[PDB]
Write a protein that binds this ligand. Structure first.
Ligand code: NA
Ligand code: NA
Ligand code: NA
Ligand code: NA
Lengths: 309, 311, 308, 312
């Protein structure tokens, strides 16, 4: 009850990057340093194994290990929300119940993608997991190729476990929910400022907070600041020029907080974009980005692409 | 060597994306599955996709999926080409599923571009290059489900590999003709376009959902020349089958025809009663003798259907 | 630092895994069993050992159970994951995942069924000794391979080797304790003498699942051959058939676990369930876990599960 | 009634090889080396193969690897040899899934051991076997030295009432073998050094063999062409060498020395040391290289030629 309201009050949730060692196994030391940096800079929640976290590339044993690890090490200092959704109701059920048993505070649930279903199918799917604990519903039609229509959100909102919506359709859809008292986090970093201050969004579930968490906290807490929004836009444009998480993986390797190791099918942004990133870090100021090391361009041969992880 | 194996996939005109039927507790009905595959072979299907979108590969555990492929090869592999849907948005899953499927004697692989976790053009090529060397491969472009079009530049690059059999293309006849005019083999992924794709745009044939119901008629459409009459007669059935996302239609129809149990793995649920009545009417317009099974088509009561969450 | 905390423990319960009727874990019932162990002075739990039917678990349910136990109880009791395997690959992955989820220690058996050379055994243990505090498990009755003293003395030089769960007997326990190695008896009917006469730090116990208070008294309040004699009937009953057949049957009779068995374990037959009702009365039911009157149960009360 | 023919087709096999699983340098299966090992067995009179038994390191496989190897062997060789999947487990759930998957992919038979480590009661053991016995031709594996639990005759006699019980792989010895054969139960010896006397003096149908990995033609001779004490005595030094450390350490070392498998070990197995590899070269000379699998001169191999993999 207050578990769900504890999620509803979060303004800055980081969709945290999963860092890798050279053979593609998780780098738990790098991961811990990233989550600590997020806490120190006023991140209030983490999504573990979301799209930015490459949950789709995880075996389920890695994923529950990472949720349990994150609860064990950080559960007292940050809200841990497992991405335990799936296009398979069986996996969503299994993952969500194992997630809560290891003490995660919440679950992020997308509608079934690729294997898309009917409105009745979609409701049936969400009813199997909504009862298990506090739940953020994830609408990202650019990835799923299926819009969760307002009628479905309204019906799901009748359950008190439905904490709110991670919305990516845009600020009109955000406002359609917030004006009826439904909590919304923007999923679009380049819209979250206008979403928070003009459209009643509680805050952001952010990719950009992986690089500049202090600046993203400032954006959601310290009142409208279109000057700061405009200073971040070039970084946000760079981050989303290829599909997330290609930008943030490339960037965190340039900042030296993650090794230059990619699980396929992701590959780094090319040299031309890594040179652009150095200029963006200098223009914003290195002190605002995670890590202490000097940003590097890196050579192509620094990047390790792994298929057998 | 590989050239003959690839040419054996390229010659196929009718490939059925076969439905996976279930027991009351949500496990595979292998008995019902074997009868479906036998019915496809008897009515001219030359190939089968095992665990495609239509076969709910998305809902299988990998041990279930690999077993169904090995089972299809062992029982039917001398009588039909067995093409495993061993694709994934995860390169690691695609590598292991594909090498295991080929090691168990499947004739080909269907490989979609990474969906949901979509990647760059460079990433897409790197993904396909890990599996294209393993054997005859059909690249699957269905941007309506993946939300990412495989652009012609990826297809032209992959077609330099002799294991690249061809494309299952869902974008339309214009995209079909961009490949067939250069001699890249194309199967239509769209039942309501495949007649025109086949006779007017150089498509070799169809990777079909409708062939689950009327395999005889789909074979006739793909072999016996232009037949606008027969294509129009089927259009109402194809419109019924795709009014909700596949395979809700085919799953419902095969239970109504009595060739699979009315058992659904969530998040799929059957078409409602008024649609099942519509289906009985469509079966009578075309003729029950053209549909799979012998039992009279039934409407079925809402409570005849079982929905499984924990399969 | 971390290893010294494990070396002090005297009562470690090899905790039973209870099931719902479809064969899935009964986490409510599991949590109730662990809360009772803590209330009655149990200082550690083995999660998914032989008693816990680790061998019957899927990977994800074993790793989940360890993580669940750390999250719910890690502050009140030491959680030792049974992450050992006859496969080095499985021992590596389970041990590193167990420690990442915050378990305090790992229990490591020598490879069973696919048994290996002494050199192979040393190679196996070295892949996991570096990951955290490790108890080496010698149970030649189940592995059909005795870990020789030579191997234990060499491993004991590694500061991550906390000590040995030893089942060979009290002469073997003393050979290790007199040479400075920490030993827990793995034999409930030997652990008293082991503790008071042979230098054993305490017990990794099955019987503590039924009578955790009496087992704590047996390990802490001094030599007491009369209490030991009073428990010997219950211990002989618990080991008539291979563990965990006895403990699974008893906890069903006490009403703290459903009468649900994962094959290939089946319950003790009716004559033995009647003996257990008598042993409970002889000892006093207030000493046994749970509040319900001890039932005999019918043969048809027991659900045997193959597909779970 | 097809069940009867299928089970009888297993019962008539006299030479069954517990085939070694060979690896690439990173620990994955070497399917090329495996196909060459299986082709050699067929060319030299082996009539069946156990896929991923103890000798084949089934205990170290993930089930996706194991099921793949069964389907691969059925698909490439199923017409030329009988394929028996080791789909047994100390877990009844794993035994049921592995066995129904194995049969669904066309394996001819299943090898079922009694639960090891997590051992059960007589009643439990019967319950375990009854869940898989109905799926098809089944060989019950009694190996008390590895399981630490003898499958007692009362259990075997009860199981032999099922038409799908093809027979027993028995390791207790010739007196236990005779107990079963004198009652008409088909038995294969699982002890290479006993299988000659078991075959000709105690009514064993043949052998489920480790040694046939090295000298398949000699083992076929031992099982088909009558009593031959001299040939049996000449294989004994090789058979003692193969079992001085737990199987399959010996056969893994030997197949590397003969150059038919790469010198790659999945832990917890490690090669016999140099002194034993030098003995092996001597044993091969004594018998004749022509009788051992492969065409390459036998090598001693250096310690540093061996790769040990934990994270496979
Ligand atoms: Na996310
Ligand atoms: Na398909
Ligand atoms: Na234990
Ligand atoms: Na074997």
């Amino acid at each position: 009850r207050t578990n769900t309201d504890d999620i509803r009050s979060l303004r800055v949730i980081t969709a945290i990057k999963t860092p890798y060692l050279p053979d593609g196994r998780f780098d738990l030391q790098a991961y811990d340093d990233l989550v600590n940096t997020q806490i120190e800079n006023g991140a209030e929640g983490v999504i573990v194994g979301g799209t930015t976290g490459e949950g789709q590339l995880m075996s389920w044993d890695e994923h529950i290990m990472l949720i349990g690890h994150t609860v064990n090490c950080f559960g007292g200092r940050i809200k841990v929300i497992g991405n335990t959704g799936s296009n398979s109701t069986r996996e969503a059920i299994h993952a969500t119940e194992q997630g809560f048993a290891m003490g995660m505070h919440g679950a992020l649930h997308i509608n079934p993608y690729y294997g898309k279903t009917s409105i009745e199918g979609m409701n049936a799917h969400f009813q199997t997991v909504l009862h298990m604990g506090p739940t953020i519903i994830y609408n990202v039609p650019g990835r799923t190729c299926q819009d969760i229509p307002p009628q479905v959100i309204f019906k799901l909102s009748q359950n008190p476990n439905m904490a709110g919506v991670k919305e990516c359709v845009g600020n009109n859809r955000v406002e359609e929910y917030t004006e009826k008292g439904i909590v919304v986090w923007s999923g679009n970093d380049d819209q979250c400022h206008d979403s928070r201050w003009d459209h009643g969004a509680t805050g952001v579930i952010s990719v950009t907070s992986n690089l500049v968490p202090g600046l993203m906290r400032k954006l959601m807490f310290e009142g409208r600041n279109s000057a700061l929004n405009a200073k971040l836009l070039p970084l946000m444009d760079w981050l989303f020029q290829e599909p997330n998480p290609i930008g943030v993986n490339t960037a965190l390797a340039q900042l030296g907080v993650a090794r230059p190791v990619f699980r396929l099918p992701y590959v780094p942004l090319p040299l031309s974009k890594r040179i652009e990133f150095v200029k963006l870090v200098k223009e914003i100021g290195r002190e605002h980005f995670v890590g202490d090391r000097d940003v590097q361009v890196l050579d192509d041969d620094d990047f390790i692409l792994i298929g057998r992880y």
